[PDB]
Amino acid sequence: DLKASSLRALKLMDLTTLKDDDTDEKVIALCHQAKTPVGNTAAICIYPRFIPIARKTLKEQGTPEIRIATVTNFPHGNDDIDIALAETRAAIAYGADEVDVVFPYRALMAGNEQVGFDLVKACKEACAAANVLLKVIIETGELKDEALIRKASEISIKAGADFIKTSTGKVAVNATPESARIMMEVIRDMGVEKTVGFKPAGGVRTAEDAQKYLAIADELFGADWADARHYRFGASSLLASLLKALGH
Ligand SMILES: [Mg+2]
Ligand SMILES: [Mg+2]
């Protein structure tokens, strides 16, 4: 049923705005939108500079349980660990609940597996010390090949990713059911489904597509696995489509 999958998907959304024209007022509006008439999203995802006003806004409307996710090393996934760590420490100091860091995928495409491992591990150590979850964006659209998607997923998991996420939403190709299945198969094959969640992101716009992404999760790990600690939708306009499927 689409309605059951849509409500489920809504409660798993990282409701996102990551735009050149973002403003405090736009993030405040996103916070109000996260408190939907059928329930709250799992989180918002915003640039780090909007975290403090977002936290205040979420608290004052009585939804402090809507988590605050942000992005670092974003969107480029450069291989400078000092910079990626510095942005991650800034995100923490701002008040992030979760940091979505971009894996250095161009370095991996060049044959360097080590910098990706160290970059994820450095950011994880900072986040873990602050009780902040770390998601790792591997950019499946640029990786393109299934072997590289598996490898970037494997490196991120071994380096301590709490989530692996398909995409930044800033490149030509983002989440696809094919890329989602590959990444979830890595979680399954590595036996880390209890400690590593999955997050399709970018281009996920319809309730029909959200249903397909959850179906893959249900198929691989059972219908009870995809909770907020283990599954998120990185999306924006998807919320309107999920609500329309629900009667709002
Ligand atoms: Mg470099
Ligand atoms: Mg070393």
Residue numbers in the entry: 3 to 250
Sentences from the study reporting this entry:
Deoxyribose-5-phosphate aldolases (DERAs) are acetaldehyde-dependent, Class I aldolases catalysing in nature a reversible aldol reaction between an acetaldehyde donor (C2 compound) and glyceraldehyde-3-phosphate acceptor (C3 compound, C3P) to generate deoxyribose-5-phosphate, DRP (C5 compound). The 3D structures of several DERA enzymes have been solved, and there are also a few complex structures available. These have revealed that despite of relatively low sequence identity, all DERA enzymes have the ubiquitous TIM (α/β)8-barrel fold where the catalytic amino acids as well as other amino acid residues around the active site seem to be relatively well conserved. The DERA reaction proceeds via Schiff base formation between an active site lysine residue (K167 in Ec DERA) and the donor acetaldehyde substrate. The active site of DERA is located in a deep binding cleft, where the donor acetaldehyde binds to the bottom of the cleft and the acceptor glyceraldehyde-3-phosphate to the upper part, near the cleft entrance.
